[PDB]
């Protein structure tokens, strides 16, 4: 249980932010705001849901809200590092229906509580 430490506002290297509540039971809930240049569904909140087990975290965002539907979703999997300069290091998949078949994009996001 990395509850009090995970809970808060985070920023990745693309300038995207999420705000999350980590319950004692391991529920992750909150909102994600994408600001990655050239992508869809930016600058409005999307629902974040996921699960954590100690330092091990996973959450997903469906890119559909009352503002914009990008017919896609992302899952993040990684580890929380507490203490001075606390970090969430993640691998993500961004999946959607491509022209020929199911698409997957892959990347790494590094999250800090520094704005
Ligand atoms: O472009 C999108 C939806 C927005 C994706 C934002 C990505 S998720 C991983 C990375 N981290 C972050 O903070 N922002 C980016 N969806 C569709 C449009 C057409 N094909 C994918």
Residue numbers in the entry: 23 to 137
Publication passage describing the model:
The monomeric variant M-Sav was tested as an alternative host for iminium catalysis. Although it lacks the subunit interface and shares moderate sequence identity with T-Sav (55%), M-Sav has high affinity to biotin (KD = 2.8 nM). Catalysis by 2 in M-Sav was mildly improved (20% 1,4-addition product, entry 2) but there remained a substantial amount of the 1,2-addition side product (7%). The melting temperature of M-Sav increased significantly when ligand 1 or 2 was included (+20 °C) as assessed by circular dichroism spectroscopy, implying its binding to the biotinylated catalysts. Tyr111 in M-Sav : 2 is a relatively bulky residue located in proximity to the secondary amine motif and corresponds to Ser112 in T-Sav : 2. Glu120 in M-Sav : 2 is in proximity and spatially corresponds to Leu124 in T-Sav : 2. Though modifying Glu120 slightly improved the overall yield of the 1,4-addition product, the enantioselectivity of the catalysis remained low (entry 8). In contrast, the monomeric M-Sav contains a solvent-exposed site and was found to be a poor host for iminium catalysis.
Tetrameric streptavidin (T-Sav) has been popularly used, engineered and evolved for hosting reactions that are mediated by biotin-appended chemical catalysts. We have recently reported an organocatalytic 1,4 conjugate addition of nitromethane to cinnamaldehydes within a protein environment through adaptation of the streptavidin–biotin technology. In this system, biotin was covalently modified with pyrrolidine groups, resulting in ligands 1 and 2 which differ by one stereocenter. Here, we performed mechanistic investigations on how a protein host affects iminium catalysis.
